[PDB]
């Protein structure tokens with residue numbers, strides 16, 4: 207297959223919903239079609255949206271905004287049904303503008319391939335780290351496919367957000383893993399506080415599991 | 422395929438040596454200058470190399486390789502001294518080609534920033550995993566700068582093969598961290614074998630440290 | 638020495654050019670040409686530089702049979718992808734400002750921006766000249782242009798525009 211690219215007009219980028227939005231029913235997932243490099247001379251952009259080739263009419267197009275570089279950017283947002291997205295339907299965005307010799311079409315859908323359930327394991331701090339002021343709580347998330355996932359940490363009630371998560375790494379068996387690291391003051395760990403790693407993924411039962419870790 | 426318009430002419434990408442190559446004297450670190458979008462019409466490529474502005478002559482230019490898109494790719498490789506690279510010398514590849522108005526110059530050197538020593542922590546399998554036929558031995562390596570690092574594993578002092586290591590992640594204090602995971606058959610763990618996470622980094626004493634892990 | 642002063646004119650009017658540009662120096666019939674004070678052409682009225690190279694830069698002067706040695710013209714031949722040209726760099730309030738983003742060998746240049754003090758002033762899908770009809774004080778500052786030659790992103794060195802009061 208040969209690469210056929212295009213030259214000197216507006217460009218289009220189509221972005222998927224966030225994983226957490228498709229996976230928790232009360233959240234609102236969105237596909238986003240962004241048009242950049244719109245001139246002042248031909249600023250008007252038209253969007254047509256399709257879900258598996260059938261045109262839909264519920265998309266919210268925003269006003270155009272002039273960028274720092276003096277081009278216009280325009281964004282159209284389409285609300286998706288959770289089940290549509292997870293059943294693999296294709297969302298197409300078609301963009302029309304007078305500086306395009308023809309409309310630009312982009313298509314996006316959920317990652318293909320056989321899903322694999324994540325296995326989620328929490329690991330306490332190394333004995334050798336307890337000599338520091340701050341300690342590291344580890345959540346290992348392995349065996350998952352596709353790579354789309356959300357991992358978050360919580361402490362008692364609330365979200366703990368002094369953590370960082372690695373990207374997904376392709377493992378030797380063709381599934382993915384990642385690690386997430388929560389840093390907490392050693393006193394909070396030694397006083398018996400319960401820390402929980404929450405994971406959301408399409409191949410968990412109810413798209414959710416939670417593992418906790420205490421002293 | 423149809424040969425495309427390359428109005429821009431060539432492009433040049435310049436790659437550092439591998440972290441392990443600069444840290445082990447038995448290995449040979451290289452800088453790699455890669456020239457892409459070389460045309461059939463103007464195929465000739467010249468290379469000039471400089472170390473802190475001093476031209477050097479010990480680069481090895483590999484021969485043209487045609488690509489699937491009907492462009493040439495050309496690679497020049499310069500061996501560097503471990504200590505030159507680690508002390509911050511600048512390597513410049515200059516790439517001449519008649520489709521360009523001027524030669525392209527890229528320069529690379531190691532990450533600047535105050536070095537910081539990796540703290541290395543081994544973590545056994547979660548109790549929950551122990552119900553599986555394979556288990557996961559974890560090595561956390563945190564607090565290090567620069568991001569250039571290499572990690573390996575051993576069992577009773579002989580190298581293991583089935584491990585994967587994450588890319589380095591920027592932590593909240595501007596240092597880096599990563600985890601490395603080795604997968605072993607549960608029996609190897611329960612049998613009391615001694616595993617090791619080995620870490621190589623410029624801020625470690627002798628560029629090396631080993632941390633062990635096993636069951637009691 | 639009781640005569641008039643001759644004058645050098647360039648076509649096109651760009652005093653700053655790229656290599657491989659054509660330039661034509663003209664003198665307003667035995668017409669002599671001077672380049673860095675060395676004599677170049679004995680009689681011809683215009684001096685054609687077909688494919689400019691860095692050595693063509695410098696001071697040009699001329700005289701004719703019945704006129705005196707001209708004031709000098711500095712010609713500047715640059716090396717690179719992009720050169721931002723203007724008839725001059727000093728404008729008074731309400732003067733037109735004409736800027737050209739000139740590519741090497743007139744290579745086609747798409748997604749072009751002219752910037753003023755680091756910020757977008759004008760974008761074009763295909764290369765065009767930037768005309769400001771009526772200069773104000775707000776047009777003063779450093780300018781450059783940039784764009785894509787194929788998929789390669791290229792930009793010009795900066796140039797200073799002063800607006801006078």
Ligand SMILES: *[C@@H]1O[C@H](CO)[C@@H](O[C@@H]2O[C@H](CO)[C@@H](O[C@@H]3O[C@H](CO[C@H]4O[C@H](CO)[C@@H](O)[C@H](O)[C@@H]4O[C@@H]4O[C@H](CO)[C@@H](O[C@@H]5O[C@H](CO)[C@H](O)[C@H](O)[C@H]5O)[C@H](O)[C@H]4NC(C)=O)[C@@H](O)[C@H](O[C@H]4O[C@H](CO)[C@@H](O)[C@H](O)[C@@H]4O[C@@H]4O[C@H](CO)[C@@H](O)[C@H](O)[C@H]4NC(C)=O)[C@@H]3O)[C@H](O)[C@H]2NC(C)=O)[C@H](O)[C@H]1NC(C)=O
Pocket residue numbers: 217219221222223224227235236237238240242243273274275277279748749750760
């Ligand atoms: C003038 O000024 C403009 C600057 O404003 C400038 O516009 C930029 O132009 C760039 C092109 O020149 C364009 O570059 C692309 O960037 C892509 C990533 O964009 C995200 O990340 C950027 C930061 O890295 C952000 O700045 C962007 O805004 C964007 O951020 C994301 O935005 C989406 C939608 O808003 C958002 O998702 C939505 O979030 C909401 C809540 O906000 C909900 O969660 C919704 O549910 C959800 O839908 C994201 O959260 C948000 N993420 C953030 C902020 O992090 C990048 O992907 C592009 O790269 C691909 O294409 C290029 C071709 O140019 C390839 O070279 C490259 O290989 C990439 O290839 C892709 O790889 C994919 C997988 O890896 C593969 O699947 C694809 O097939 C493949 N793509 C293709 C096409 O084949 C690209 O670099 C940039 O986004 C523009 N910026 C903005 C702000 O619009 C303009 O260029 C300037 N003009 C001139 C003349 O100078």
Ligand SMILES: *[C@@H]1O[C@H](CO)[C@@H](O[C@@H]2O[C@H](CO)[C@@H](O[C@@H]3O[C@H](CO[C@H]4O[C@H](CO)[C@@H](O)[C@H](O)[C@@H]4O[C@@H]4O[C@H](CO)[C@@H](O[C@@H]5O[C@H](CO)[C@H](O)[C@H](O)[C@H]5O)[C@H](O)[C@H]4NC(C)=O)[C@@H](O)[C@H](O[C@H]4O[C@H](CO)[C@@H](O)[C@H](O)[C@@H]4O[C@@H]4O[C@H](CO)[C@@H](O)[C@H](O)[C@H]4NC(C)=O)[C@@H]3O)[C@H](O)[C@H]2NC(C)=O)[C@H](O)[C@H]1NC(C)=O
Pocket residue numbers: 209425432434436437438439442450451452453455457458488489490492494
């Ligand atoms: C026709 O076909 C051609 C063949 O594919 C095609 O060529 C490609 O052109 C691309 C540009 O269009 C080019 O893309 C760049 O890729 C960079 C990464 O390249 C590495 O990884 C790729 C896979 O991800 C491989 O395909 C590459 O070959 C390359 O792999 C590396 O190879 C080296 C050298 O051999 C190796 O190091 C050496 O390893 C050996 C072992 O063999 C020894 O150990 C030596 O000691 C050691 O030196 C690496 O390990 C190996 N890595 C891997 C992972 O395999 C990427 O860095 C580039 O990104 C920059 O440029 C774009 C602009 O295009 C920016 O948008 C981007 O952010 C990056 O640039 C930033 O901004 C500056 C401007 O460039 C830059 O100065 C900054 O530093 C930078 N900022 C950062 C990094 O934060 C870029 O995407 C691709 O490599 C080409 N493929 C090749 C050469 O195979 C050509 O385009 C086609 N023509 C058409 C369609 O017209």
Ligand code: NA
Pocket residue numbers: 216243244245246247248249303304305
């Ligand atoms: Na437009």
Ligand code: NA
Pocket residue numbers: 290291292293294295296314315316
């Ligand atoms: Na889908």
Ligand code: NA
Pocket residue numbers: 330331332335342343542561
């Ligand atoms: Na730890």
Ligand code: NA
Pocket residue numbers: 329330331332342343344544561
């Ligand atoms: Na830990």
Ligand code: NA
Pocket residue numbers: 394395396397398399400419420421
């Ligand atoms: Na605790």
Ligand code: NA
Pocket residue numbers: 505506507508509510511529530531
């Ligand atoms: Na260096």
Ligand code: NA
Pocket residue numbers: 327346545546547550557558
């Ligand atoms: Na484990």
Ligand code: NA
Pocket residue numbers: 329346544545546547557558559
């Ligand atoms: Na583990």
Ligand code: NA
Pocket residue numbers: 609610611612613614615616634635636
């Ligand atoms: Na053991």
